Design a protein around this ligand. Structure first.
Ligand SMILES: CN(C)CC(=O)Nc1ccc2[nH]c(=O)c3ccccc3c2c1
Ligand SMILES: [Zn+2]
Length: 200
């Protein structure tokens, strides 16, 4: 029962999401090996994901979490990159910091997983991990963290916790990464279609 509502570029909801994509790009310690070499994206399309089943399932668990955490869901908007975005938007999320589902504040970190682990073999057409041509897709997701276990960084949550926060302890300009272990603690709210852009 998933529908995808296309947002117009002049829509304020389109604009606030593009600005989160763009302003959270960083350099990566692999010099672009996994995700490509770029400072910004070309946003081709932003679609709002509407699914009543999956939404109700998210909100039910969010209420459970907040009740176990002094009425605080600790809800964030985070990026998720995966080859299986198609399954995720229709079926929901299913089952470094464990065997959970990973999310990032840096859009460019999630971009490293679009074609698979460590960027896989790159795009299906050119086998190029820095392809400036093929169309990529990321999810921008509403995620319930509850009480998050702090991990200073370079299955189930820990007892009494609802998620893990990977705090970058060495990396200079990195933002945080997060892990949940219950698929129903995240709702995929926007599907973003884009290309990475070659520096001039
Ligand atoms: C056991 N690991 C090789 C599996 C793994 O790394 N899976 C995986 C799979 C997909 C992932 N997608 C992300 O957007 C992401 C963002 C920040 C950190 C990790 C991820 C991410 C991680
Ligand atoms: Zn390509």
């Amino acid at each position: 029962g998933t529908i995808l509502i296309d947002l117009s570029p002049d829509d304020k909801e389109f604009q606030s999401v593009e600005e989160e994509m763009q302003s959270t790009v960083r350099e990566h310690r692999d010099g672009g090996h996994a995700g490509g070499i770029f400072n910004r994206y070309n946003i081709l399309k932003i679609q709002k994901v509407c699914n009543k089943k999956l939404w109700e399932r998210y909100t039910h668990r969010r209420k459970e979490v907040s009740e176990e955490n002094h009425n605080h869901a600790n809800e964030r908007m985070l990026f998720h990159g995966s080859p299986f975005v198609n399954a995720i938007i229709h079926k929901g999320f299913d089952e470094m910091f464990g065997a959970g589902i990973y999310f990032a504040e840096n859009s460019s970190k999630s971009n490293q997983y679009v074609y698979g682990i460590g960027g896989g073999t790159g795009c299906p057409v050119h086998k190029d991990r820095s392809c400036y041509i093929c169309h990529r897709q990321l999810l921008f997701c509403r995620v319930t963290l509850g009480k998050s276990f702090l991990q200073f960084s370079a299955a189930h949550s820990p007892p009494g916790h609802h998620s893990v926060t990977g705090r970058p302890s060495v990396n200079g300009l990195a933002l945080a990464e997060y892990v949940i272990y219950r698929g129903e603690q995240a709702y995929p709210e926007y599907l973003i279609t884009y290309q990475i852009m070659r520096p001039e």
